Every structure is written in structure tokens, then in C-alpha cells.
Design a protein around this ligand. Structure first.
Ligand SMILES: [Mn+2]
Ligand SMILES: [Mn+2]
Ligand SMILES: [Mn+2]
Ligand SMILES: [Mn+2]
Ligand SMILES: [Mn+2]
Ligand SMILES: [Mn+2]
Ligand SMILES: [Mn+2]
Ligand SMILES: [Mn+2]
Ligand code: NA
Length: 326
DNA sequence: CGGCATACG
DNA sequence: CGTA
DNA sequence: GCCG
């Protein structure tokens, strides 16, 4: 049978039920915009179950027994199978509320609560926001200023160029420090909206103080448009032929003791990690985050040298990054 | 009924 | 709140 | 919305 947790099954990048999963993900996004985090999670889980199936769902009977499919998710699939369209999904898609909330929450620095307040105030367009600069945080100002570039897919060639400049700054800041590409690109995605790097040093503690030194060296090379510790959510000025474009880059430092946990958490997917943390606590009584895995009865942390160690300690079959696309 | 992942900036 |  |  299909396991109930997304961390118990492989989910490849390319799968066979895109139409159905995308419809469920619209409903999940809309639930989020209305502040229904539980409904969002159900619709996300149901969409993910379809991504893990080996073949297209052709008939409604093939949903029987699948986890996270109840009355509502099943009716969505039913109507898509019967008619090619789901009335509910189309009503959401076309709604002013959905389209504006999607527009605003895709801005760096804006989440659902901020977007909803702006919507209730009657704002509808990016220009509306630019017309009221006093109502913006510095983060939001940077997100709006660079919004067009930040909406342009990041390509592998960009990733490679960014990894070179980050490696150069890291090596200038601390000899022997390493840079690991994480996020969606480590899962095999060919494009993305941002690039994520995890930085460590093989000698425990040597990485203390590292991220401000890296940030100073990147800024002195003119590479930083926006910044500001362990996590830096940056916008880089990435050189292009005769020009440049803004790219979102996340830089994360971890001590080598935490590195496997940070690598696992920052590699994703987001649903995969939520499900893995839920599995850890609810099924094995252990507390997982990007720092470690804690046994609250013995009050001890599990020493891991690899991601494989973490899966093993949780009693899970190991899944490589390209099968974590839940 | 109530949980739903768990951190840092 | 925002970010991941 | 689904489920323990
Ligand atoms: Mn396949
Ligand atoms: Mn319903
Ligand atoms: Mn019908
Ligand atoms: Mn990413
Ligand atoms: Mn820390
Ligand atoms: Mn990122
Ligand atoms: Mn309830
Ligand atoms: Mn409910
Ligand atoms: Na946002």
C-alpha cells in the first residue's frame, strides 16, 4: 500500500499526474490565503500522493485506499476525470482575491497576513504598493524593487556562476571551509526561483563568525544588493553579459556536527521535511530539526555523519535527494 | 476533539 | 511578522 | 481536510 507519510515513499521530479496534482495545489494555496493551514496541508499531502503513483490515474476507483483522499479531494479528481475541469478550482483561479494574494505573497518580504491586510485595504497591484513606500519594510522594499528579476527562472548556469563567487568568498574568509549546493537544485531541478548554499568547516567551531566575514567579502566585490548570524537571505547582483540581474541566494552556516541535519533540512522538499519531522516525533518519539535529532527521554542528541545515518536512526529507507520531491 | 514541523532574522 |  |  501507499505509505501515509511522504518521507516513506520516493517522489521523483517527473511524475504522471500533473493535471490532478496542480489542481489540488491550487486549493491548498487558496486554503493558505484564507488562513486554513490544516486544509492546506491535506490538499498538499493529497497532491503529493499522486506524484508518487507509478502511472496516470484514469479512473476514480484507483483512488480507493489512498491516504489523504476523502470526500473533497476525491470529488476534485472525479470532476477532472469526467470533465477536464473542476468548478471549484476554476472559481478560485479566476477570483480577484486569489490572483491578488498570489501576486502579493510572491513578493520577498510579504506573507499571507501582510497580503491579506493590503487586500482588505483595497490594494491590488504592485504599483499600488510602490505608491505607499512608507508602509513597506526594508525587506519588502528590496523584494519589490527587484521583483521582475526575482520572477525570472534561475538556471543552472546561474547556479554555477554563483557557486564560484560564493566559494571564492568563503575560501577568503576561512581556509578549508566548504560550500554545498542545497535546495531544489540538489533535488535535480533544472530551474528555480532562488539558490541555496550550506557552508561548514571540518573542524568543529572554526566556522564561528564566518557568515559576516563572507558577507563583507561579497559586498566588497559589489555582489550584494540586499542583505540582513547563521542564515543570510540575500539578493545578489549576478553579472551577465554586458549587464546584471538580481538573484535570491540563501547562505547558511552550520558546524560540522550539525551539517547532515542542515543538509537534509535545506535540501527539502518543504513537504518532505514537514512529513519527516512529523514522522520522527509521532512515530518514533524523536524531535527533528535542521540542527539535530533529539531523544527527549534520554536527553541526548543523535550523532550523524551523513543523511543516511539520519534515515537509519528513524527506521526509514534512505531516499536520495532526487526522490524527495514531495 | 485537536493536530497539523520547527527553526532563525 | 518575515524568512527557510 | 483528513486522521490518530
Ligand atoms: Mn515514473
Ligand atoms: Mn468539503
Ligand atoms: Mn460531473
Ligand atoms: Mn531554494
Ligand atoms: Mn544554530
Ligand atoms: Mn532559498
Ligand atoms: Mn476539530
Ligand atoms: Mn476542518
Ligand atoms: Na513572500
Amino acid at each position: 500500500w501507499m505509505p501515509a507519510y511522504a518521507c516513506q515513499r520516493p517522489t521523483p521530479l517527473t511524475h504522471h499526474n500533473t493535471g490532478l496534482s496542480e489542481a489540488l495545489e491550487i486549493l491548498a494555496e487558496a486554503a493558505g490565503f484564507e488562513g486554513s493551514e490544516g486544509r492546506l496541508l491535506t490538499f498538499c499531502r493529497a497532491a503529493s500522493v499522486l506524484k508518487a503513483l507509478p502511472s496516470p490515474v484514469t479512473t476514480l476507483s484507483q483512488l480507493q485506499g489512498l491516504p489523504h483522499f476523502g470526500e473533497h479531494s476525491s470529488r476534485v479528481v472525479q470532476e477532472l476525470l469526467e470533465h477536464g475541469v473542476c468548478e471549484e478550482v476554476e472559481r478560485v483561479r479566476r477570483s480577484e482575491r486569489y490572483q491578488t494574494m498570489k501576486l502579493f505573497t510572491q513578493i520577498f518580504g510579504v506573507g499571507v497576513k501582510t497580503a491579506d491586510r493590503w487586500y482588505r485595504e483595497g490594494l491590488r497591484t504592485l504599483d499600488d504598493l510602490r505608491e505607499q513606500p512608507q508602509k513597506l519594510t526594508q525587506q519588502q522594499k528590496a523584494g519589490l524593487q527587484h521583483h521582475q528579476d526575482l520572477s525570472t527562472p534561475v538556471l543552472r548556469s546561474d547556479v554555477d556562476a554563483l557557486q564560484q563567487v560564493v566559494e571564492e568568498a568563503v575560501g577568503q574568509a576561512l581556509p578549508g571551509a566548504t560550500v554545498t549546493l542545497t535546495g531544489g537544485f540538489r533535488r535535480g531541478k533544472l530551474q528555480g526561483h532562488d539558490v541555496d548554499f550550506l557552508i561548514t568547516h571540518p573542524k568543529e567551531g572554526q566556522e564561528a563568525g564566518l557568515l559576516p566575514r563572507v558577507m563583507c567579502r561579497l559586498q566588497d566585490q559589489g555582489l550584494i544588493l540586499y542583505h540582513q548570524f547563521e542564515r543570510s537571505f540575500c539578493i545578489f547582483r549576478l553579472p551577465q553579459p554586458g549587464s546584471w540581474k538580481a538573484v535570491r541566494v540563501d547562505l547558511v552556516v552550520a558546524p560540522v556536527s550539525q551539517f547532515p541535519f542542515a543538509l537534509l533540512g535545506w535540501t527539502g522538499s518543504k513537504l518532505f521535511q514537514r512529513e519527516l519531522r512529523r514522522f520522527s516525533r509521532k512515530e518514533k518519539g524523536l524531535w527533528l530539526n535542521s540542527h539535530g535529532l533529539f531523544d527527549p527521554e534520554q536527553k541526548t542528541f543523535f550523532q550523524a555523519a551523513s543523511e543516511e545515518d539520519i534515515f537509519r536512526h528513524l527506521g526509514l529507507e534512505y531516499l536520495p535527494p532526487e526522490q524527495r520531491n514531495a
